[model samples]
Each structure stands twice: as C-alpha cells, then as structure tokens.
Target chain A: FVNQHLCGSHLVEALYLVCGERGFFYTPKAMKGIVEQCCTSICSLYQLENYCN
Target chain B: FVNQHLCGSHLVEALYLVCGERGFFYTPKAMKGIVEQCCTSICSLYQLENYCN
Candidate 1:
C-alpha cells in the first residue's frame, strides 16, 4: 500500500533516491535536504504518485 | 515555531508559495503538485531553512 512505502526513513530515502539524481527531478539535493530536515516529522504516507509524478 | 509554520495546509501552501514561481527556486508547479499530493501525510514541520536553503 501507499502507507507501507513511505513510513519512516523509507520515505526519506525513497524521495532521496529520485530527488538526489540532479538536474531532472525536483530540487535534487534540495529535496534531500528537506527530507533529512523533516524526516522525523513525516510520520506517514499519503500519496506516492504525488512525489513520483 | 517550525511546526506552527508548516502543520497542515499551511505547509503545502508554504512550499507552494516558493516553489510555485517559475525559475530560480525549484521545479515550480511540479513542487506544488507534490505538496498537494502529499499534503495530508506531511504531518509536521522540521527545518524551514532546509526548504528555503
């Protein structure tokens, strides 16, 4: 399920995987920075496609 | 506090405000879409400067 995919560090790492690439995805390191900064508060997952899409 | 700044739609809108614009920042509309897509699961805030930085 969506929740299962993005629970804790999973979501952080998940987003980091995509956003860490650089030049194409969102902000790359910027996104990763947000994930690390907010990873603790992320708590749950709402929509995976939102990030992937 | 950070939580107060980004604790619900505020966070979504907050990110949108910066990422919504074109150029310089992040992916613009793409970032907005991500926020709306994951707004519900966002839960709380962590580092404001992370996103800003």
Candidate 2:
C-alpha cells in the first residue's frame, strides 16, 4: 500500500464503510497526512476494529 | 514516517526491503491510534507517487 496510500496537508480523513459487509465510519483528516506519507496497510488493518466493530 | 509509523492489531507486518540501502523489513505492532490523534507536517510537499521507474 506504499506510494499509493493517501496523504495530504489539507487535512484528510479516511472513511471505511462496512454495511453487513458495508457500513460507514469516520476518521480524522489530520491522520490522513501521515497515513499518506507512510502509505502502508499496516495501520489500516489494525484500525479495522474501529470501523468493523 | 509520522507517529514513528506502524500500527497494532491481532497481527501486523511491514517490511520495506531496500537493497544496498539495507535489507529486511518488519512491523508488527498496533497502530499508534490515528497518527497521534492527528498532526501536521511542515513540508507542504506531503505527496509523491510510487514507482519512480
């Protein structure tokens, strides 16, 4: 997920929706910058609970 | 890498293998909770593409 990961200074938020296999969840945009810089799935996978749950 | 990079979960793994620069990569730890709950970078140039090639 490197390089392709989302990152920006304009404050970005990541939304992971899983409703019965799909739903909606919100994430702060500030973190998006780091996530974009790091560009890895390592964090996203861990955060699955925050959205999946 | 913001928040020192890397995240947490039941199991995590991140290996950035770069030859000459170094070999071997591994990251197995829970995410630092949305990159320290959100932080900004001074280098407005917070974006780059992958596969320079």
Candidate 3:
C-alpha cells in the first residue's frame, strides 16, 4: 500500500508515510539507491524527517 | 578507543567497531559527512553491518 500509493511520485514522501496512529518510523534501509544518495549527501539521517517535510 | 584505533584507516571499518561485548548499534545519524555520503550512495543502512565485515 505504501510503496504504491505514497511512494509513487516522490521518494521523499515515503519518509513521512505512516502505517498506524502510532506513526511508525521507517529506516533509510528501505529507500531506493537514488534517494539514499541524496539523503546522505544533503543531510544526516537524523535530519531526514525535517528534510522531507 | 574504537574510533581512534579501529576507524583510523577505513570509514567502512567504523561500522563494526563495537563499543562493548553487547555490540551496540549506531544509526547513520552518527556517521561523518564524507562517510555518510559514501554509505547511502554505495549501499543501504541495513547492509552497513555486512558492508564493513
């Protein structure tokens, strides 16, 4: 559901896509190669939440 | 001790540099700028442990 609906357009949006009311967090491990590259270069993993939003 | 002696040469080696016998895991958030850049580009966060070894 997430991979298709949320992550269809922009890879960054996937970072914010939550599964439940608790708002589960996903790691960079699930990101694609391209997005992962941009993430590490532009900012730190800790900043990913801020970066996407 | 870990960073100075173990990670002195290769940045990848830093992944396996354990603090104690319990084997603490670190997020990519702690990685240096350059090392972080290399990590996300070349590989995924889940593979960091395997990557270093």
Model 1 stretches astray by more than 4 angstroms = A1-53, B1-4, B22-49
| Model 3 agreement with the true structure over B1-53: per-residue lDDT tens digits | 22232221233233433211222223334455323544334433344443321
Highest TM-score model number: 1
- Candidate 3 Cα deviation (angstroms), residue B36: 23
lDDT of 2 by residue, A2-45 (tens): 22354321111232211122322322233543343333433443
Residue B44, candidate 3: alpha-carbon lDDT: 36
Docking class of 2: incorrect
Q: Each model's C-alpha lDDT? A: 0.35, 0.25, 0.33
Return the lDDT, model 3, position A9.
22
Maximum-lDDT candidate? 1
For each of the candidates, give the backbone clash count: 0, 15, 0
lDDT of 2 by residue, B1-53 (tens): 32233332100111111111121111112143222222222111121011001
TM-scores of the models, in the order given:
0.23, 0.21, 0.18
**What is the per-residue lDDT of model 3 for residues A1-53, given as tens digits with 9 covering 90 to 100?**
22232221232333433211122122334455323444334433344343331
Candidate 3 residue pairs in clash (backbone atoms < 3 Å): none
lDDT (Cα, 0-100) at B47 in candidate 3: 44
Arrange candidates by DockQ, descending: 1, 2, 3
**Which DockQ value does candidate 2 get?**
0.02
Model 1 lDDT tens row, B1-53: 23342433344344434442221222324454333343434423333334433
